[PDB]
Design a binder for this molecule. Structure first.
Ligand SMILES: [Mg+2]
Ligand SMILES: [Mg+2]
Ligand SMILES: [Mg+2]
Ligand SMILES: [Mg+2]
Ligand SMILES: [Mg+2]
Ligand SMILES: [Mg+2]
Ligand SMILES: [Mg+2]
Ligand SMILES: [Mg+2]
Ligand SMILES: [Mg+2]
Ligand SMILES: [Mg+2]
Ligand SMILES: [Mg+2]
Ligand SMILES: [Mg+2]
Ligand SMILES: [Mg+2]
Ligand SMILES: [Mg+2]
Ligand SMILES: [Mg+2]
Ligand SMILES: [Mg+2]
Ligand SMILES: [Mg+2]
Ligand SMILES: [Mg+2]
Ligand SMILES: [Mg+2]
Ligand SMILES: [Mg+2]
Ligand SMILES: [Mg+2]
Ligand SMILES: [Mg+2]
Ligand SMILES: [Mg+2]
Ligand SMILES: [Mg+2]
Ligand SMILES: [Mg+2]
Ligand SMILES: [Mg+2]
Ligand SMILES: [Mg+2]
Ligand SMILES: [Mg+2]
Ligand SMILES: [Mg+2]
Ligand SMILES: [Mg+2]
Ligand SMILES: [Mg+2]
Ligand SMILES: [Mg+2]
Ligand SMILES: [Mg+2]
Ligand SMILES: [Mg+2]
Ligand SMILES: [Mg+2]
Ligand SMILES: [Mg+2]
Ligand SMILES: [Mg+2]
Ligand SMILES: [Mg+2]
Ligand SMILES: [Mg+2]
Ligand SMILES: [Mg+2]
Ligand SMILES: [Mg+2]
Ligand SMILES: [Mg+2]
Ligand SMILES: [Mg+2]
Ligand SMILES: [Mg+2]
Ligand SMILES: [Mg+2]
Ligand SMILES: [Mg+2]
Ligand SMILES: [Mg+2]
Ligand SMILES: [Mg+2]
Ligand SMILES: [Mg+2]
Ligand SMILES: [Mg+2]
Ligand SMILES: [Mg+2]
Ligand SMILES: [Mg+2]
Ligand SMILES: [Mg+2]
Ligand SMILES: [Mg+2]
Ligand SMILES: [Mg+2]
Ligand SMILES: [Mg+2]
Ligand SMILES: [Mg+2]
Ligand SMILES: [Mg+2]
Ligand SMILES: [Mg+2]
Ligand SMILES: [Mg+2]
Ligand SMILES: [Mg+2]
Ligand SMILES: [Mg+2]
Ligand SMILES: [Mg+2]
Ligand SMILES: [Mg+2]
Ligand SMILES: [Mg+2]
Ligand SMILES: [Mg+2]
Ligand SMILES: [Mg+2]
Ligand SMILES: [Mg+2]
Ligand SMILES: [Mg+2]
Ligand SMILES: [Mg+2]
Ligand SMILES: [Mg+2]
Ligand SMILES: [Mg+2]
Ligand SMILES: [Mg+2]
Ligand SMILES: [Mg+2]
Ligand SMILES: [Mg+2]
Ligand SMILES: [Mg+2]
Ligand SMILES: [Mg+2]
Ligand SMILES: [Mg+2]
Ligand SMILES: [Mg+2]
Ligand SMILES: [Mg+2]
Ligand SMILES: [Mg+2]
Ligand SMILES: [Mg+2]
Ligand SMILES: [Mg+2]
Ligand SMILES: [Mg+2]
Ligand SMILES: [Mg+2]
Ligand SMILES: [Mg+2]
Ligand SMILES: [Mg+2]
Ligand SMILES: [Mg+2]
Ligand SMILES: [Mg+2]
Ligand SMILES: [Mg+2]
Ligand SMILES: [Mg+2]
Ligand SMILES: [Mg+2]
Ligand SMILES: [Mg+2]
Ligand SMILES: [Mg+2]
Ligand SMILES: [Mg+2]
Ligand SMILES: [Mg+2]
Ligand SMILES: [Mg+2]
Ligand SMILES: [Mg+2]
Ligand SMILES: [Mg+2]
Ligand SMILES: [Mg+2]
Ligand SMILES: [Mg+2]
Ligand SMILES: [Mg+2]
Ligand SMILES: [Mg+2]
Ligand SMILES: [Mg+2]
Ligand SMILES: [Mg+2]
Ligand SMILES: [Mg+2]
Ligand SMILES: [Mg+2]
Ligand SMILES: [Mg+2]
Ligand SMILES: [Mg+2]
Ligand SMILES: [Mg+2]
Ligand SMILES: [Mg+2]
Ligand SMILES: [Mg+2]
Ligand SMILES: [Mg+2]
Ligand SMILES: [Mg+2]
Ligand SMILES: [Mg+2]
Ligand SMILES: [Mg+2]
Ligand SMILES: [Mg+2]
Ligand SMILES: [Mg+2]
Ligand SMILES: [Mg+2]
Ligand SMILES: [Mg+2]
Ligand SMILES: [Mg+2]
Ligand SMILES: [Mg+2]
Ligand SMILES: [Mg+2]
Ligand SMILES: [Mg+2]
Ligand SMILES: [Mg+2]
Ligand SMILES: [Zn+2]
Ligand SMILES: [Zn+2]
Lengths: 110, 181, 69, 141, 77, 53
RNA sequence: GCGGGGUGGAGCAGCCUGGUAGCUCGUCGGGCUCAUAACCCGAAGGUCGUCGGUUCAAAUCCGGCCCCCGCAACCA
RNA sequence: GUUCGGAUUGGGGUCUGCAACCCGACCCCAUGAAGCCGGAAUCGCUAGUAAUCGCGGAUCAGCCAUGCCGCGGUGAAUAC
RNA sequence: UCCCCCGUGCCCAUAGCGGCGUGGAACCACCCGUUCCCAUUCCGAACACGGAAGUGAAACGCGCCAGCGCCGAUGGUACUGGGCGGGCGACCGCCUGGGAGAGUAGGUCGGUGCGGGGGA
RNA sequence: CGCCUCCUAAAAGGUAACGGAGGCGCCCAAAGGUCCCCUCAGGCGGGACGGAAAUCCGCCGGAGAGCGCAAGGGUAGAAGGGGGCCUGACUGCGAGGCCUGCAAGCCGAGCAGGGGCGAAAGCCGGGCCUAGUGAACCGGUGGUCCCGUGUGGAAGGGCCAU
RNA sequence: CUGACUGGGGCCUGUAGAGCACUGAUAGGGCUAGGGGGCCCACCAGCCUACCAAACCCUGUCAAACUCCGAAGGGUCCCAG
């Protein structure tokens, strides 16, 4: 018996894989926000970034934009440029939208 | 947020006495109110005068909250019902507006009721929830004899966080519900 | 909440005919009621209004013991 | 007599009668049984004849178990017509019975009472039969 | 005597068109089906009538992923 | 296609040529169809209008 | 074998085009008459041959079985 | 459908009578029905009459009398 | 390289239902608010934001139990590719190679990849 | 008597009979594109008028509902339900294949023009799918400005569309 | 040298057989709505049922247009004779 959270999750994630891109999946908890870029062909994570690993400050929204500029920064160093955004169960808005835009300024392509 | 009598009374008198009688080991284990849903299964407005802004204007005054429509799930011959036809109203009260409504309900409404002999003890869910009916919306204070065209009562559903009828019964009586038997 | 669809809530003065006044909130600042929780027959313990009847019938006739034995 | 009260389809292809029974091959209810030695379509008319015969021996007493049921519809073209113009009409119902099935079992009766009704029953059938009583082998299935 | 029956439809010649380990070109049809008996996997398109066909030159592979259904893939050569 | 479900054409409202043909239910949709479609003549999109077939 | 049919008690509508059962007589209660008829005033009664299905809903559309009318059954 | 109308019933009392269950009248509290002027049809009355109003008497313990036999008050329309 | 938790996959119920027990430092959750972004055919329930007083009550994670569900041999049989017999038939046998399903024994209250966070 | 579904059909495809059963000769301006959100039938309990069945609350319920219409296949990790903006129910093409005697029928990635939705990855050349159909001849209609019987026009034809 | 046939290997399938989980059928038993029947009532509930009988459970079975299962075979592609 699935839940709206679970179904919505598959619902967007399934459409992302099919386009074959590297996925910039984003996790957003009550305090923190994590993001890892995954190659689903190997079941393997290639680069990560999280607020909790960066020990970042207060405002969740700016925190997101900063973990975003971070993820890109480590990313372009591995040649990763093209990638696709996994908004998971999270509406593209607020904290998640902010991380996305951070990744963009960083130069990651999407 | 709002300080109101029943909301206050819940934490102050209802909460402790409940912890007494059933001895919970966690604050969240103890019975709470989640929501009171009000309903008007109406359907007298199926065809006829499907203008029921008069009752949506009514329910909006009673609860300080705009009701939503309910529409037919399936068409019915014997009821003369097209699928999707507008046949009722439903407003869901949570938090402050929930208390304020129950507050006026317990202190005013049930008293004004024709030959009131106490709420039905047996209208208990089995899973600790409670439902009751009203024959008239005049039963409330905010609806004068003047502003009404016709008698229209309602369904009232109150959801608890309880698991049994017994904790539910206590939570509600402790709040101020008058039961006959 | 949404704006422009919602009646506005204000501190309200419900008055009863016993002279109970209730401090609450409502869409109307002042209301009078005919009856309340503070005075109702079923409500006030067991104030059995007009009839503390005990029936009285049917043993109760007793008019009288004057029929003979 | 026996016949399905309703069915998804009116007419059924004829099929085959190869092999021993798929099941129904062990005593299950009564004390004694009548088992089919060779394959056949046993008609309702025979099952009822066989049944009635058995109750007719017992008079008052016993219990009769019918383990076969005529669910296969039997078709015949109307007399004197030529081939073609569709499938015949359903005229009766049959029980498809292979070698080794119990068709009838009896209970609550002396052994000679049972040997005899099962025998008399057996004459009413279009096949050879063997009478068997319940063994631990039956018990063990 | 007459029949109220008599009719049937043209057969549609459905089923798998290319089996596992067979080399296909981009465009080749792989499976013809009514509904998703098989699902498109890597390098496999699906047409408006459910027809699975190859998106790249390469080699067919099947995969039975339980409750996730059966999949057809093409592996680049 | 029927008596009520008619066939029709769409005329480019700018160059007046018919580039697309379709159908409608004239009871369900009594007004003339209006749609933007690529007109091959003007080489862009144009509001196209239902015209007699 | 092909076409048509079964609706208060009698005889016909309504079915095609699904929602709504109608007409004449008859029955019953009242009136005129000494009385009956006629005539006048009111009123009851069909759950539509069945069983199944389609539908939101079937007298109505579709299937099964039943009974009735008509026509056919030829070269042989 | 009312301060119209007063049936129906609930509750409580008075009286007559040996006795008011079936089955009396009357008084009081409450209940407050049908009925918005009557289908086909049909009755009475020609003047102090019809219509309307009250009073008495016979029978008779009481009374189901709104019946009957009388009595006065007011008092018409119309007959080509 | 080991333990716990947060992510995200793979295997596709040996992973599930139920029952009992356990975890809040950390992470996660509920939670505290509804100013702001955003939101309710009504409702800050959901989605969303700003938060960190409390609580592991719900959820989740981790263990335990075989009542249900799920998996399930060995053996034997049915059936059968090919090769031969028998019967008037319905049908029935032998040889060689293949071999179920049911049922029985029994197994199961998950295993594993990658990246993070913490601990030894 | 053509077309679709199931069985017969002997586990590839195909397969006959006056064998067994049913459907089609439509439909939808949204019942289409896309973005976002949502999850059913049914059972038990509870609720004014309220019923077996209207609408409301809770718990159980993997799909037994729904998907216009027959059946099968498919399907909630949506193809089902709601909303917003929209017209790709495109123009010019088409690598490569399914099927197949012919002629037909079908699926289709991708390049270009000019668009729609989306932050984007991307999707979109009607519809969950398989029926809803008719080759050519003759002619009608809109456009094109190709031929125009000595020449300029015209008549009439060709081409694209219907 | 690519052929019929043959060896190994992968993928495809829903028949034989079997099964009752779905669609239907189905004999007996248990349990049990609904009616019928017999007591008692019209004050509305009750009690008994060697009666007909839903849904559920058990035992036991049937099916071209049923399948939780499911062969031997068969089709196709690669390498080899
Ligand atoms: Mg892996
Ligand atoms: Mg209860
Ligand atoms: Mg009021
Ligand atoms: Mg509760
Ligand atoms: Mg045959
Ligand atoms: Mg025979
Ligand atoms: Mg036959
Ligand atoms: Mg005949
Ligand atoms: Mg024949
Ligand atoms: Mg025949
Ligand atoms: Mg026969
Ligand atoms: Mg047998
Ligand atoms: Mg014999
Ligand atoms: Mg067995
Ligand atoms: Mg005939
Ligand atoms: Mg015919
Ligand atoms: Mg046929
Ligand atoms: Mg054929
Ligand atoms: Mg064919
Ligand atoms: Mg076919
Ligand atoms: Mg296939
Ligand atoms: Mg497509
Ligand atoms: Mg499609
Ligand atoms: Mg493989
Ligand atoms: Mg692969
Ligand atoms: Mg008649
Ligand atoms: Mg007609
Ligand atoms: Mg009509
Ligand atoms: Mg009469
Ligand atoms: Mg007469
Ligand atoms: Mg229906
Ligand atoms: Mg009707
Ligand atoms: Mg019917
Ligand atoms: Mg019906
Ligand atoms: Mg009929
Ligand atoms: Mg004749
Ligand atoms: Mg009145
Ligand atoms: Mg009396
Ligand atoms: Mg009055
Ligand atoms: Mg009246
Ligand atoms: Mg008046
Ligand atoms: Mg008068
Ligand atoms: Mg008068
Ligand atoms: Mg007259
Ligand atoms: Mg005179
Ligand atoms: Mg006197
Ligand atoms: Mg007197
Ligand atoms: Mg009297
Ligand atoms: Mg008098
Ligand atoms: Mg995890
Ligand atoms: Mg894992
Ligand atoms: Mg568990
Ligand atoms: Mg604990
Ligand atoms: Mg736990
Ligand atoms: Mg904590
Ligand atoms: Mg702590
Ligand atoms: Mg706080
Ligand atoms: Mg605000
Ligand atoms: Mg602010
Ligand atoms: Mg909140
Ligand atoms: Mg817990
Ligand atoms: Mg969660
Ligand atoms: Mg164990
Ligand atoms: Mg298995
Ligand atoms: Mg097994
Ligand atoms: Mg074995
Ligand atoms: Mg052989
Ligand atoms: Mg053999
Ligand atoms: Mg062998
Ligand atoms: Mg062997
Ligand atoms: Mg097998
Ligand atoms: Mg086995
Ligand atoms: Mg387990
Ligand atoms: Mg790990
Ligand atoms: Mg680590
Ligand atoms: Mg045709
Ligand atoms: Mg076939
Ligand atoms: Mg086949
Ligand atoms: Mg085949
Ligand atoms: Mg082929
Ligand atoms: Mg036909
Ligand atoms: Mg829409
Ligand atoms: Mg659609
Ligand atoms: Mg839309
Ligand atoms: Mg429900
Ligand atoms: Mg209910
Ligand atoms: Mg009710
Ligand atoms: Mg209801
Ligand atoms: Mg379905
Ligand atoms: Mg726009
Ligand atoms: Mg080609
Ligand atoms: Mg061809
Ligand atoms: Mg075709
Ligand atoms: Mg574009
Ligand atoms: Mg844009
Ligand atoms: Mg394209
Ligand atoms: Mg559609
Ligand atoms: Mg279509
Ligand atoms: Mg076509
Ligand atoms: Mg010609
Ligand atoms: Mg010709
Ligand atoms: Mg022409
Ligand atoms: Mg020229
Ligand atoms: Mg010239
Ligand atoms: Mg000139
Ligand atoms: Mg010229
Ligand atoms: Mg000119
Ligand atoms: Mg021209
Ligand atoms: Mg010209
Ligand atoms: Mg053309
Ligand atoms: Mg060679
Ligand atoms: Mg070869
Ligand atoms: Mg070869
Ligand atoms: Mg070979
Ligand atoms: Mg078989
Ligand atoms: Mg079954
Ligand atoms: Mg079993
Ligand atoms: Mg068979
Ligand atoms: Mg079959
Ligand atoms: Mg079979
Ligand atoms: Mg094989
Ligand atoms: Mg074959
Ligand atoms: Mg082979
Ligand atoms: Mg092979
Ligand atoms: Mg070779
Ligand atoms: Zn008061
Ligand atoms: Zn144009």
């Amino acid at each position: 018996r699935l839940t709206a959270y679970e179904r919505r999750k598959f619902r967007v994630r399934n459409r992302i894989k099919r386009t074959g891109r590297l996925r910039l999946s984003v996790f957003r908890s009550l305090k923190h926000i994590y993001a890892q870029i995954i190659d689903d062909e190997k079941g393997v994570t290639l680069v990560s970034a999280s607020s909790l690993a960066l020990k970042l400050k207060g405002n969740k929204t700016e925190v997101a934009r900063q973990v975003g500029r971070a993820l890109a920064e480590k990313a372009l160093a591995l040649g990763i440029k093209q990638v696709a955004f996994d908004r998971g169960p999270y509406k593209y808005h607020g904290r998640v939208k902010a991380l996305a835009e951070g990744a963009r300024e960083g130069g990651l392509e999407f | 947020p709002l300080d109101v009598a029943l909301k206050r009374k819940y934490y102050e008198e209802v909460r402790p006495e409940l912890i007494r009688r059933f001895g919970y080991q966690n604050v969240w284990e103890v019975p709470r109110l989640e929501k009171v849903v009000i309903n008007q299964g109406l359907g007298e407005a199926k065809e006829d005068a499907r203008i029921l802004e008069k009752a949506a204007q009514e329910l909006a005054l009673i609860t300080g909250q705009k009701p939503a429509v309910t529409r037919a799930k399936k068409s019915i011959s014997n009821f003369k019902l097209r699928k999707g036809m507008p046949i009722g109203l439903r407003v869901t009260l949570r938090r402050d507006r929930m208390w304020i409504f129950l507050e006026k309900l317990l202190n005013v409404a049930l008293p004004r009721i024709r030959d009131f002999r106490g709420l039905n003890p047996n209208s208990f869910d089995g899973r600790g929830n409670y439902n009751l009916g009203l024959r008239e919306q005049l039963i409330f204070p905010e609806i004068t004899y003047d502003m009404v065209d016709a008698l229209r009562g309602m369904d009232i559903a109150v959801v608890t966080t309880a698991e049994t009828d017994e904790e539910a019964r206590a939570l509600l009586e402790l709040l101020g519900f008058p039961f006959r038997k | 909440m949404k704006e422009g669809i919602h009646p506005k809530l204000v501190p309200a003065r419900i008055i009863c005919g016993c002279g109970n006044v209730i401090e609450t909130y409502s869409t109307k600042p002042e209301i009078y009621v005919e009856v309340c929780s503070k005075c109702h027959p079923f409500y006030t313990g067991q104030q059995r209004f007009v009839d503390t009847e005990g029936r009285v019938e049917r043993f109760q006739r007793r008019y009288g013991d004057s029929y003979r034995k | 007599m026996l016949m399905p009260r309703r069915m998804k389809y009116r007419k059924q292809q004829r099929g085959r009668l190869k092999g021993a029974t798929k099941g129904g091959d062990y005593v299950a209810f009564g004390d004694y049984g009548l088992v089919a030695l060779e394959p056949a379509w046993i008609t309702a008319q025979q099952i009822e004849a066989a049944r009635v015969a058995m109750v007719r021996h017992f008079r008052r007493g016993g219990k009769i178990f019918i383990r076969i049921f005529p669910d296969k519809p039997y078709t015949k073209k109307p007399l004197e017509v030529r081939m073609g113009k569709g499938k015949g009409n359903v005229e009766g119902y049959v029980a498809v019975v292979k070698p080794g099935r119990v068709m009838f079992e009896v209970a609550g009766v002396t052994e000679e009472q049972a040997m005899e009704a099962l025998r008399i029953a057996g004459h009413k059938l279009p096949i050879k039969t063997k009478i068997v009583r319940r063994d631990a082998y039956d018990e063990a299935q | 005597g007459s029949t109220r029956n008599g009719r049937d439809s043209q057969a549609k010649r459905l089923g798998v068109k290319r089996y596992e380990g067979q080399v296909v070109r981009a465009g080749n049809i792989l499976v013809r089906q009514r509904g998703t008996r098989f699902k498109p996997g890597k390098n496999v398109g699906m047409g408006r009538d459910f027809t699975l066909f190859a998106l790249v030159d390469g080699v067919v592979e099947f995969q039975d992923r339980g409750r996730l259904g059966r999949y057809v893939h093409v592996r680049p050569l | 296609a029927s008596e009520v479900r008619i066939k029709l054409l769409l005329e480019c409202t700018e160059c007046k040529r018919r580039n697309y043909a379709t159908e409608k239910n004239k009871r369900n949709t009594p007004n003339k169809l209006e749609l933007r479609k690529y007109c091959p003549w003007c080489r862009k999109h144009t509001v196209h209008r239902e015209v007699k077939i």
